[PDB]
Amino acid sequence: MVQPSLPQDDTPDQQEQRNRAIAQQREAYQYSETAGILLIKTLPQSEMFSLKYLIERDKGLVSLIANTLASNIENIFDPFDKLEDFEEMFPLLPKPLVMNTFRNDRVFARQRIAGPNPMVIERVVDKLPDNFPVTDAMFQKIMFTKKTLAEAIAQGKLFITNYKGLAELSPGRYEYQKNGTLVQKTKTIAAPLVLYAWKPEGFGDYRGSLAPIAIQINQQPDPITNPIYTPRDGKHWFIAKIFAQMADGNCHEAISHLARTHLILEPFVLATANELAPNHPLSVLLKPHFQFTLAINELAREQFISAGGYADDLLAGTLEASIAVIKAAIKEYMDNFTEFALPRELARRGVGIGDVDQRGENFLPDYPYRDDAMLLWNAIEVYVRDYLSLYYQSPVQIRQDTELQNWVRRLVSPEGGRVTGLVSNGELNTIEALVAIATQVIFVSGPQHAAVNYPQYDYMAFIPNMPLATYATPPNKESNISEATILNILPPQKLAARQLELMRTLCVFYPNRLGYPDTEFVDVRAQQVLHQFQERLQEIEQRIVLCNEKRLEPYTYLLPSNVPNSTSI
Amino acid sequence: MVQPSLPQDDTPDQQEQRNRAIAQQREAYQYSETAGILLIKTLPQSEMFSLKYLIERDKGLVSLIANTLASNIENIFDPFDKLEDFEEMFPLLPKPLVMNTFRNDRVFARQRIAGPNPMVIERVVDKLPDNFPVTDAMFQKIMFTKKTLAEAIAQGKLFITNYKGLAELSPGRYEYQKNGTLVQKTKTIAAPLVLYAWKPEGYRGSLAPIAIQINQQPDPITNPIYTPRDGKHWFIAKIFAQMADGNCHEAISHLARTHLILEPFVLATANELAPNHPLSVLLKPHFQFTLAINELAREQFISAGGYADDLLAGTLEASIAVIKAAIKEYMDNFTEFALPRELARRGVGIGDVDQRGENFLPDYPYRDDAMLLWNAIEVYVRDYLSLYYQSPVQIRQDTELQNWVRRLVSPEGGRVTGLVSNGELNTIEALVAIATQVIFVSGPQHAAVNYPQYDYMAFIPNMPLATYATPPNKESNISEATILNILPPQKLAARQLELMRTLCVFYPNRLGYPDTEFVDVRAQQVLHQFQERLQEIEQRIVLCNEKRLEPYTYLLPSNVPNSTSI
Ligand SMILES: [Cl-]
Ligand SMILES: [Cl-]
Ligand SMILES: [Cl-]
Ligand SMILES: [Fe+3]
Ligand SMILES: [Fe+3]
């Protein structure tokens, strides 16, 4: 029941124990790497999943055994026989929400602002990419308008998702036995550009909604081998959306999920253990939001990014290519850590709260991820500030905290996570800078991970909406498209089963809850502050419910009751 | 890194530390009960499975997803279409060893001495039970002999498995939807008597089944005595006897007398012994993950809708009653359930020999191999405790050890009324026997009853945990459909394979190889000698398996865990 205190304020015998405790934690929490990704060398037993967590995780795996027994899907690398079969994969599981409406263009587009990866869409400024040769004739034909691309861009109506990150990927390979011999096949890579337009009129109703304009499946334009597809292209348009969804799913899993929630949190958990005493106020604040994070990252090391793991079998590129994308997304996040704060991140894509027209309306008014995440970001910020101000009243105490200074030096260190863009001037000198750091770490661990992890089942457990790999080249625009052509593009049965298995495991339960730690703060002042944060969460929950009532489709993933306290699944 | 020491041999400051540590442990290891079974209230995080364990357990679960994906079995309460379908449940799993030869009478009988439940067979003395009216005409017709039942009993040739303990079971019920209507059905329970005979001729002598009476009260029409000359009726009779053996195995031999009887010893260790107490340092490596696996059994095995509810013959309530009665009888006669005394009480111990000095049951691989492990463990804990206890007064004056015993004997501490003589632990050799039996149960015994489960109970027709139709009339015609209706429906056969695969996927630890070494150099030396003996025992068992009809691998030291952990 020790009261938290800064190291400078203690007695040389108190300081001695802190150093002893820190020395013990350093031995227990040793730094390691797998394929260049920072991870703990050996996991401490105290950091393992609880018994309660294991019981829930086992219920999800047993439920997959039962659902597989009921299902007609087979353990083969053959395609499905019918498109309808993809809808029979859930006899004993909840039906994914996107399954009925996934063919609709609005449903396709909405996923950009309310699906599993609401992190790619950016507003177009000045012009389109020169490798994306959309013409005025195309835009006017799709929008049934006389407006030009330049006029639409000048008014902030055009948005784009550019998947150039996957352009350098080496295509994944798979093999199997079919009649005594070994078959070797290769996945098809795509790095599409997708143009979206915001339509105030909407489809029939006056609500308004983002609509997709064009898709170019690969980066280098060519009128024959890589044309621009539009909604008027019919079946070809449908296939183009499949490849775009595959791109979004690969960026989601590599960049948005694994890299920028799970793995960028690992250095902060390790630096907290390696530099902060158990009774340090920052350790007492951050640790609830690290519960099971080291453990779930070890499972990702063993099951997700391993040879034969989920990323190896399901994603578009080779395991080596996927890990290269993951590490590059980690480095850019760490180099520009402060710039990936939620308001600055949205503003850099031109879809922040500040991006408005002359009237003051946002260019992208319907962004449920943005609106709900902003509420959680602001509430966490207030909570962190009140908490830290209980222990930091003057910025000199920030500068005089040796454990905190070591904590920052460990993070910016090459072997400690290389968070080069953590602080300004090479040192942490102000309370408000530490407020922003702790705010972003808590926001990533809870709200952000909730927003990318939980929609995975609703949108990626139904394979046709977002297949993690495509298994045939895009058909020629002139070429006829049968059901078999699509079934050959979509994943074979065994790999579709593997994708459902992965998505079900990720969203089967909530290991903890935002603002509700296992152990109450020893300090009464901290407990009152935590209580205030919980009260704000209840208010935010009610506001989101009100927002959901008027929204086209409810967006439930950032409801406080659905946000975990930590990245733990 | 604190040298182990007895509490009375410590300074008052040191004693205060032990009392504080013990008080902390008492708060973390609180006693709780589920359906009258002593369990832990809250599992401490340090007692959870490791990350390494969870990785192995997840591999086994994922393998069942993949094996299910490659199977043609469906999620229905219908029977299989063909008996052959039971052999196609393992496209991506190891084929159970018993699958090819389970119809053979010798393979049926040898499971009594080398199967998952080698704990039931007992030698017949004086007479058969009066409710088991086997006649000289039956015995002579089966053995193709003129010897009488009395003469064979006088020579110690006859053995019996009497499953009367299952006679008071309430039959289990299952229900399911069919055409908008809810079908409700009931399992069929049996409490058979099975007569076996030791046949020297066979060359190598082997045990042979002679008669099966499916239920306890004899009746020539509704419960006759079946013999190998009854064809398909004999085959069905063996099914019901195997079902009985499986239910006694899971309720009595596995859950009750490995997992659950170990629980009070783990909690008493945490509640009465300091961390540097020599007995705690000796036993804790053999308790690794035991509290955790018992919590999973509480949640998945004996729970409403759990494995025992779905798979076993009786209702969950009926099964739990059998479990608790086995626990209580074991605790009341704890010393008597030591391995040599247990075997001797069933008349199949090393001392049950004829006039020539030959054992009445020469083929008993469980007995021979377990005796080797029992003797080696006994030497190991004798030398270990000799390092800390040199004279009897130390045992008497060890206040933590005396509280340890008093906690175990107490009603809320597991009621181990037969743990100790004279109401008090007074001698060193008594503690040797207690620790030897606890370590033998947690490692060797659990290995013997747990790991044959896949090889003998994952192939459903060899040992179905429940039967789903009454035994047909002795003169009724038997079709393949009659047997398929007796065997479990598809969904429950899948559930049984699911259970057996998780139980035998991996070995969480290994006998004589703890995670952390003893801080005492003398203690480490004792352990090293124990490992050397395990190596020697491994070679001797390998030689025995070369000279045996079928190899018995489950008590090889490399296959025996250090603790009951799966
Ligand atoms: Cl067009
Ligand atoms: Cl075209
Ligand atoms: Cl007969
Ligand atoms: Fe996740
Ligand atoms: Fe077991």
Author numbering:
A (entry chain A): 1 to 569
B (entry chain B): 1 to 202, 206 to 569
From the paper:
Lipoxygenases (LOX) are key enzymes in the initial step of lipid-mediator biosynthesis. They catalyze a regio- and stereo specific dioxygenation of polyunsaturated fatty acids to yield fatty acid hydroperoxides, which can be further metabolized to a variety of signaling molecules with diverse biological functions. CspLOX2 is the LOX with the highest relative amount of bis-allylic product reported so far, hence it is a suitable candidate to study the molecular basis of the dioxygen positioning at the bis-allylic position. We demonstrate the importance of an active site clamp around the pentadiene system, which fixes the pentadiene during the reaction resulting in 11-HPODE formation.
A key residue that is located opposite of the iron ion and hence likely restricts the space in the kink region is the highly conserved Leu304. In general, mutations inserted close to the iron in the kink of the channel had the strongest effects on the product specificity, while amino acid substitutions closer to the entrance or the bottom of the channel resulted in smaller changes. In case of 13-HPODE, Leu304 and Leu502 are rather facing the side of 13S-HPODE formation, while Leu506 faces the side for 13R-HPODE formation.
